[PDB]
Amino acid sequence: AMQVSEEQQSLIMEDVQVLLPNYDDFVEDVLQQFMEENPETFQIFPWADASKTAKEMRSHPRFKSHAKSIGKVISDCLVDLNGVKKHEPKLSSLGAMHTKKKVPTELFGKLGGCILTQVVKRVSEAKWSEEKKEAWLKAYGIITVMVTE
Amino acid sequence: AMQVSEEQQSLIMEDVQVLLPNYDDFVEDVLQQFMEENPETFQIFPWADASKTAKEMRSHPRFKSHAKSIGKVISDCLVDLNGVKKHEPKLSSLGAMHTKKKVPTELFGKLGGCILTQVVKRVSEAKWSEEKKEAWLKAYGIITVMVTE
Numbered sequence: 001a002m003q004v005s006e007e008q009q010s011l012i013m014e015d016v017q018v019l020l021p022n023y024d025d026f027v028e029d030v031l032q033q034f035m036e037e038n039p040e041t042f043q044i045f046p047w048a049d050a051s052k053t054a055k056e057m058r059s060h061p062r063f064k065s066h067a068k069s070i071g072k073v074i075s076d077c078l079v080d081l082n083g084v085k086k087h088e089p090k091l092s093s094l095g096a097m098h099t100k101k102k103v104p105t106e107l108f109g110k111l112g113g114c115i116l117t118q119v120v121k122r123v124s125e126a127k128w129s130e131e132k133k134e135a136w137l138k139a140y141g142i143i144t145v146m147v148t149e
Numbered sequence: 150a151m152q153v154s155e156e157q158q159s160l161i162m163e164d165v166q167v168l169l170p171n172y173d174d175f176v177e178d179v180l181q182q183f184m185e186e187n188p189e190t191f192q193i194f195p196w197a198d199a200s201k202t203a204k205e206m207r208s209h210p211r212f213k214s215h216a217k218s219i220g221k222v223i224s225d226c227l228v229d230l231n232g233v234k235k236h237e238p239k240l241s242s243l244g245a246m247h248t249k250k251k252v253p254t255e256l257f258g259k260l261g262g263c264i265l266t267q268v269v270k271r272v273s274e275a276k277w278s279e280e281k282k283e284a285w286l287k288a289y290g291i292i293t294v295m296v297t298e
C-alpha cells in the first residue's frame with residue numbers, strides 16, 4: 001500500500017507542472033528553510049559552513065549542487081511514484097548516507113514539512129486542497145523509503 | 150617557518166616520481182588503512198557504508214572518487230610546497246568540512262601516519278631516510294593547514 005492512486009499521481013503531476021519553470025529555486029527554498037529550522041544540519045551536512053546563515057550558504061556552489069542532487073531524486077520519483085523501483089540501483093548508495101546513526105530519524109518528518117510548505121507557497125490557493133496535501137504526504141513517504149532502504 | 154628547505158622539496162619530488170605511476174592505488178591504500186585503523190571514520194565520511202569493511206568499500210565509486218579528490222589536493226601541494234597559497238581560493242570551502250566539531254583533531258595525525266606508511270611501502274629501503282621522513286612530515290603539516298584554515 002506504498003502505492004498511490006491514479007488520482008493522487010495525477011494531482012501531483014498537476015503541481016509538478018506549476019513547479020517546473022522555477023524548480024531549482026523551489027528546491028533551494030526547501031533546503032534553506034530546512035537548515036533555518038533545524039540548525040543541527042550544519043553539523044550533519046559536511047559542506048555546510050557553521051559560521052554562515054542558511055541564506056548566506058545558499059550562494060555557495062556546494063549548497064546549489066546538493067539542492068540540484070536531491071531535487072533530481074525527488075523529481076524522478078514524483079513523476080512516476082508507483083514505478084519508483086526502476087530507480088533502485090542508481091539510488092542504492094543513498095541508504096548508507098541516511099542511516100539512523102548518521103541522520104536522526106525525526107529530521108525526515110521535518111524536511112517533509114518544509115517541502116509541503118514550499119509547495120503551498122508555489123501552488124495557487126484555489127488549487128491547493130486536502131486531497132493534494134495527502135497526495136504529497138504519501139509521495140514524500142515513498143521517496144523516504146527509497147532513500148533509506 | 151611553514152616553509153620547506155629546497156633540499157626537502159627536492160627529496161619530496163624524488164618520491165613523487167616513484168609514486169606517480171601508481172598514484173591512484175597509493176592514495177586508495179592510504180584511505181583504506183586510515184578507515185581500518187580508525188573505525189569512527191565510517192560515521193564521519195557520509196558515503197561510507199558501515200555494514201562493509203574498508204576493503205569492501207574500496208570497490209565503491211564514492212570511495213574511489215573521494216580518494217581521487219584528496220589525492221589531487223595532496224599532489225598539487227607536494228609539487229610546490231612553498232607556493233601553496235596559489236591554491237588558497239580553489240581550497241577555500243575545505244575549511245568548513247574540517248572543523249574540530251566535524252573532524253576530531255587527532256585524526257589528522259592518524260591520517261599522516263597512514264600516508265607515511267604507504268610512502269615507506271612504495272619507496273625503496275635504500276632510498277628512505279630520516280631526512281625524507283622529516284621532509285614528508287613537514288609537508289603533511291603544511292597540507293593540514295591548507296585544508297583547515
Ligand code: HEM
Pocket residue numbers: 041044045046047066069070073074094097098103104107108111143144145147195196
Ligand atoms: C527523502 C528525503 C531525502 C532525499 C530525497 C535526499 C536525497 C539525497 C541525495 C540524492 C543525496 C546524495 C547527494 C550527493 O551525491 O551529493 C543525499 C545525501 C545526504 N543527505 Fe539526504 N535526502 C533526504 C533526506 C535527508 C535528511 C532529512 C537529512 C538530514 C540532514 C539528509 C542528510 C544527508 C546527508 C548527511 C547526506 C550526505 C549529504 C551530503 O553528502 O551532503 N538527507 N541526500
Ligand code: HEM
Pocket residue numbers: 046047190193194195196215218219222223243246247252253256257260292293294296
Ligand atoms: C590534510 C589532510 C586532508 C586532506 C588533504 C583532505 C582533503 C579533502 C578534500 C579535498 C575533501 C573534499 C572532497 C570532495 O569535494 O568531495 C575532503 C572532504 C572531507 N574530509 Fe578531508 N582531508 C584531509 C583530512 C581529513 C581527516 C583526517 C578526516 C577525518 C575523517 C577528513 C574527513 C573529511 C570529511 C568528513 C569530508 C567531507 C568528506 C566527504 O565529504 O566525504 N579529512 N577532504
